[PDB]
Symmetry: D2
Subunit: 244 residues, 4 copies
């Protein structure tokens, strides 16, 4: 039992974008720790990653669990040198119907979790004089959508936090970036109808929904030496749905 | 007169906003966190306003204050969310309390107050929600991750709400001040604020009245086709 | 014959947005020189402005005419202390069908004209330690539209030029800003059908087309002392059609 | 192999781009304005490329070069518009020639070359147009109004063209370098580029290979769902 590869931590790795990111980072040569909210899901991740990764249960809303998970990774696999913040649900509602819990839960799962996990991995990245924090944002952080004020506020806050952290950590060669997916094919889009997914792809310049692997490719690029002079940016992967 | 609610109106930007909105013809309820401050606000606004105590961190107080305003003065049709509290620290030294308090005072308060005033604005088919953001939401500053995240969240929240409320002719906008002359800015002496003003194209720190002018514009009929935007008032410190 | 009011120059003042801007600046207390491309149009402007303005013919594509017009204003009315660059047409075409003239004419009418006129009025603004350059951009400089690559490139170039000039002239208290109209009711939108203008207003958060006076209000604000700490910005007046 | 055309490939950013695209598997035609430079490009690329002389200001030369490439090597399916010529001056001192030459070398050339390669990309239902912009298109620099306007125009042009060509699976993107180590940057000595690198979060000037890496990414299958964007490569000098 000796683990010599650099360690990547991917939260919310069970399916879709998170699963593709985790598998791509494995292919890139990392030892990947993926997280799921349940222990069953964590075991499914352990099974998928085999001897080049591990699955751990983590509710990113809880600081005690964040600290325990990162401590476990450091004590068993090594310092987290790539952090991909992908965990996170939506709780949509127009503001008149958006409850205190609807707001707080989303802000905690997305923005607070990014703050907590980034803070927790900073010591190891600083010691290594190498680090990658890659936050999965969304196109709705830029192109606002009614009913997603909580999600949009959280994602935009994550982007601003990333800029501040990039400035604080730049001299230690830690890059902090966000990837903003557009319409990507997920179980959720699979749930939608043919006609709705044509409505969606009609809004995309490339005239199709993206795939999880497109986001994985963007993250793999940002985590590599090929993006060592890129920090504090948003990398939009939306097929021209939103251009900035 | 139409009722405007301005939080944190005791001094600086908030006070200038309240006085300007009074001049524009609104009945201005300004808030302070202390009852002493609320009484001084009552005294300053006189017959064209009222002062109320409000800790914007507390939902019960928000609901009570808005209910009181509705019961005595009228529907809140202009809401200006003005908070300027900082708890700076580099992330290594930024505690959970430092993060949470800033997020609550700024972003959560914007959520709570905006939600609470929606009914009256919807009924009137008229509304102005004006959120005080900051240049730091765009031009990042080391040690202000919490403040930057909160202000950027406020801007994104404003865009979403603007889409939700637009058809009722309610506009939701943010004003982003740059370096404005204040208590703490006055505390540093000549070379330090020369360091600051050297970054400003207009080569000077702004004044609270500049932000009040932007808020007055957005709250007026002159800006009825402007919604979901950020109005930068920073002398060229940061340029779209 | 003595002219004591501050002089504003509004190019393309014959109708719609330009006409509303010119009339509002008159109401604000300026002596307004408006331009039209023909001498007939210039005479119609002279008639509309009466004793508080003048109409002059100007093809903004031509440097000799720019220099002659500004010299005439300085010699008869006073230094141009407010410049509103509004002259400018569209020549739409998908790139495969966009000719050299289609490109050059639009770039010259919009971007080159802004460069030439701003350069020409800088001396007077510098001497006065007061100045307002206000450029009418467009929402399509931000939300790109197929078939308008020339117009979009010109408007975005104008915005970048404005940022550079704002930095160069800031210490002399000259502000340089752009106003970006969205769907505003013009003869061109009047030409469109009821159903198309509902398609358009359906995209606007405020659920209606704007009016020239909305743009005039934005320009009047920027030209006043109420916006003396605003420079190098874009003021979007699009009813929520585009949010940034 | 697929044919990529890289303008201004003789040195620095352009040379790094050309070499990297060769490594990625493209047949790279690089251009220089002199025939001497074109021959040196031919020598450097050897069996995996060709060097051609091109003054990007001249439409006839653009059409001749692209026709030659089509007649000998194949359809241009990757176009990298790389120009880095400056003619700085504050507006008071910026002549008509200084403005026009920069606009022509940068923006007009992007228009002309992009237009000329559209037919082959459309036929192949594959394409990469990658335009070298600059941080100055976003963070304004006194004395560079012409360069800033041209680069920003290039970015807007790219967005419009991306919408026009997207359904044919042609992506159009810009790469915006920050402070990259070059001839002229090397000319200034330690304290001057320390002044520069102090503005960079990563606390150093970039290298041509960083821009080549970004262009290689965008030109690859790894970026097939990225279009109409600006990829900032500036070490945190300017942050979206």
């Amino acid at each position: 039992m000796t683990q010599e590869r650099k360690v990547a931590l991917v939260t919310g790795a069970s399916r879709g974008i998170g699963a593709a990111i985790a598998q791509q980072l494995i292919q890139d040569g990392y030892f990947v720790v993926g997280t799921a909210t349940s222990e069953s899901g964590a075991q499914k991740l352990t099974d998928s990653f085999g001897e080049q990764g591990a699955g751990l249960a983590l509710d990113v809303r809880n600081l005690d669990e964040i600290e325990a998970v990162v401590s476990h990774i450091e004590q068993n696999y090594g310092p987290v040198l790539v952090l991909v913040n992908n965990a996170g649900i939506t709780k949509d509602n127009l503001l008149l119907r958006m409850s205190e819990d609807d707001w707080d839960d989303i802000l905690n799962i997305h923005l607070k979790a990014v703050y907590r996990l980034s803070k927790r991995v900073l010591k190891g990245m600083t010691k290594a004089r190498f680090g990658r924090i890659i936050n999965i944002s969304s196109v709705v952080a830029h192109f606002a959508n009614p009913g997603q004020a909580n999600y949009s506020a959280a994602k935009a806050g994550i982007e601003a936090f990333s800029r501040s952290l990039a400035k604080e950590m730049g001299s230690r060669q830690i890059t902090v970036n966000s990837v903003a997916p557009g319409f990507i094919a997920t179980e959720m889009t699979d749930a939608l109808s043919e006609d709705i997914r044509k409505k969606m792809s009609d809004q995309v310049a490339l005239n199709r929904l993206g795939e999880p692997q497109d986001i994985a490719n963007a993250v793999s690029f940002l985590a590599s030496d090929k993006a060592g002079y890129i920090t504090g940016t948003v990398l939009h992967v939306n097929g021209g749905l939103y251009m900035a």
